[PDB]
Amino acid sequence: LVEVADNTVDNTKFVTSMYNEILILGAKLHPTLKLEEITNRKGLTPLALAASSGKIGVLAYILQREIHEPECRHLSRKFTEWAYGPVHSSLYDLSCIDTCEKNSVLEVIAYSSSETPNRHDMLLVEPLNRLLQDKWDRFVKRIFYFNFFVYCLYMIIFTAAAYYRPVEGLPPYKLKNTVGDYFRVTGEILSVSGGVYFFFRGIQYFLQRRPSLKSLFVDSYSEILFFVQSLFMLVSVVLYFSQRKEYVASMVFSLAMGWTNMLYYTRGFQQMGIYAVMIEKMILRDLCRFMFVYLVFLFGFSTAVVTLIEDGKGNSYNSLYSTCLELFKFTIGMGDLEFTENYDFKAVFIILLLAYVILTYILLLNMLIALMGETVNKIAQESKNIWKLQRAITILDTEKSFLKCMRKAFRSGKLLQVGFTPDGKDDYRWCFRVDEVNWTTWNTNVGIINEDPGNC
């Protein structure tokens, strides 16, 4: 039934209806048997299969399943703890969702391969969203802030150490008794340590997540950026101890890339996280297309102008690189229309320059602005959903890292009694509690667990 669902309205409606009917029939015929726990060869259950395959409707039905039939009510996953006026308090099951199982629904959704249809939207189902927000509010936000602060300190130390590098001679540079030299050496050691730390963290990420090639290209951008920064740092160290003076280039690239990577920590804040998501989307689409076309035009006109120039009779503009740079200066508002005179035909030269200026400056750039406007208009909500995924991944990673400090101390929900199993024993579940208000219903005849409305 899960395999047949395809997220359309009628298909989803019937799949849910038949799922419920078969569940009820199985409960009546074989009360002892637990149908939803059975697994296929891959080991997935109907819930895990639905979560992984991207069947949003079936997942939403399952997580909020509520059965009021007295004989078969333990099958429900949502319960009403109490109601006084228009106020209701409901409980969600969290049986196989709280990351305390082999592969919970939350982990399965978070670590998808981006091939699954709509993984962005599967975290909007009430229990998952509220659970993630609770986990963020309780303990992980402080850890994220601590990590951000430590990274800021690391970058400041790296910048200070690189600023005061020795300039006389070749590396390695001998230590001196000056206190400033000791501080500089300490900073260099700390920078190298941070680089190796990021290297190993990237390695372990690759090992654990076993990303696919296409996934490696299209999903893990931040991981790749941090890994590349660490690679630059390590290559810089290698060159430094090889007595080559080229280690400065690698160190500078690492410094700049780390300062840019500082942008990763904007996902702990809604506004800045959404802004960074939009930045990513623009870079991926608009910059790529515009740069392809612009580079084609620039190279064509640069070659034309270079071949026109004779350089007989800045100087020596008869170089492809120099002419390309001169034409690129036009894009940034610094173009000189008389940058050379070493040519025979002024009409040809000026016509070429004006054609380039009109094609690239007046048309392509403004068109890029318009396309960016359209893209901004189009991706208002997808950006928020992608930011939610980013924060969820951060939450899961943080919770996995600190198993030793608190393996189960910070566990969501609380153990509550929901009812009685048909065998007559008690039903105890790790439930997550929510509150709601409804003014239209005014239903005074429903199923409740507690006589007294309030909680403690």
Ligand X SMILES: CCCCCCCC/C=C\CCCCCCCC(=O)O[C@H](COC(=O)CCCCCCCCCCCCCCC)COP(=O)([O-])OCC[N+](C)(C)C
Ligand Y SMILES: CCCCCCCC/C=C\CCCCCCCC(=O)O[C@H](COC(=O)CCCCCCCCCCCCCCC)COP(=O)(O)OCCN
Ligand Z SMILES: CCCCCCCC/C=C\CCCCCCCC(=O)O[C@H](COC(=O)CCCCCCCCCCCCCCC)COP(=O)(O)OC[C@H](O)CO
| Residues of this chain, 267-296, that bind ligand T7X according to CB under 6 A | 280, 283
Task: Identify the bridge partners of residue 80 per DSSP, sorted by sequence position.
Answer: 90
Site string for ligand T7X, 52-71 (x = CB under 6 A): --------------------
Question: Nearest 5 degrees, angle CA 14-CA 7-CA 74?
Answer: 55
Which of 319, 381, 401, 443 touches ligand Y (CB under 6 A)? Answer: 319
Question: Which partner from the list its own copies, ligand X, ligand Y, none does 251 bind, CB cut-off 5 to 8 Å by kind?
Answer: its own copies
Question: Which partner from the list ligand X, ligand Y, Na ion, none does 333 bind, CB cut-off 5 to 8 Å by kind?
Answer: Na ion
Contact call for residue 318 and ligand X (CB under 6 A): yes
C-beta separation of 418 from 429 below 8 A: yes
- Compute φ and ψ for 5, nearest 5 degrees: -65, 140
| Residues of this chain, 206-225, that bind ligand Y according to CB under 6 A | 217-218, 221, 224-225
Contact call for residue 331 and ligand T7X (CB under 6 A): no
Question: Which partner from the list ligand Z, its own copies, ligand X, none does 269 bind, CB cut-off 5 to 8 Å by kind?
Answer: ligand Z
Question: Which partner from the list ligand T7X, ligand Z, Na ion, none does 275 bind, CB cut-off 5 to 8 Å by kind?
Answer: none
What is the C-alpha to C-alpha distance for residues 305 and 299, in angstroms, rounded to an integer?
10
Between 148 and 328, CB nearer to ligand Y: 328
Contact call for residue 316 and its own copies (CB under 8 A): no
Contact call for residue 275 and its own copies (CB under 8 A): yes
Contact call for residue 184 and ligand X (CB under 6 A): yes
C-beta separation of 230 from 202 below 8 A: yes
C-beta separation of 408 from 66 below 8 A: no
Contact call for residue 151 and ligand X (CB under 6 A): yes
DSSP string, 4-21: T--S-HHHHHHHHHHHHH
Which of 17, 129, 193, 260 touches ligand T7X (CB under 6 A)? Answer: 260
Residue 62, token pair as written in the block: 């399952």
| Tokens 């406007």 sit on residue | 373
C-beta separation of 96 from 104 below 8 A: yes
Half-sphere exposure of 306 (CA within 13 A, CB side): 17
| Residues of this chain, 94-123, that bind ligand T7X according to CB under 6 A | 114
Which of 36, 121, 126, 219 touches ligand T7X (CB under 6 A)? Answer: 219
Annotated binding-site residue numbers for Ca(2+) = 336
Between 99 and 394, CB nearer to ligand T7X: 394
Residue 4, token pair as written in the block: 């047949």
Contact call for residue 382 and ligand T7X (CB under 6 A): no
Ranges of H-type helices in 54-178: 56-63, 105-110, 126-135, 141-163
β-pairing, 426-437 with 78-83?
unpaired
| Residues of this chain, 189-218, that bind ligand X according to CB under 6 A | 190, 193-194, 197-198, 201
Between 79 and 387, CB nearer to ligand T7X: 387
In eight-state DSSP terms, residue 175 is P
**Segment interacting with Na ion, rule: CB under 5 A, options 73-81, 245-253, 328-336, 409-417:** 328-336
What is the C-alpha to C-alpha distance for residues 245 and 242, in angstroms, rounded to an integer?
9
Rounded least distance, CB 364 to ligand Z, Å? 15
| Residues of this chain, 130-149, that bind ligand X according to CB under 6 A | 147
What is the C-alpha to C-alpha distance for residues 454 and 456, in angstroms, rounded to an integer?
6
Between 169 and 333, CB nearer to Na ion: 333
Which of 299, 410, 420, 428 touches its own copies (CB under 8 A)? Answer: 299
Q: At what angle do helices 320-331 and 288-308 cross, to 10 degrees?
A: 130
Determine whether 233 is exposed, middle or buried from the number of CB atoms within 10 Å of its CB (0-12, 13-18, 19+). buried
Contact call for residue 420 and ligand Y (CB under 6 A): no
DSSP string, 253-317: HHHHHHHHHGGGGGGGSHHHHHHHHHHHHHIIIIIHHHHHHHHHHHHHHHHHHHHH---------
**Which residues contact ligand Y by CB under 6 A?**
156, 159-160, 163, 217-218, 221, 224-225, 246, 249, 284-285, 288-289, 291-292, 295-296, 299, 319-322, 324-325, 328, 345-348, 350-351, 354-355
**Which residues contact ligand X by CB under 6 A?**
147, 150-151, 153-154, 156-157, 160-161, 163-164, 180, 183-184, 186-187, 190, 193-194, 197-198, 201, 222-223, 226, 264, 318
**Which residues contact ligand T7X by CB under 6 A?**
114, 219-222, 225, 253, 256-257, 260-261, 263-264, 280, 283, 355, 386, 389-390, 393
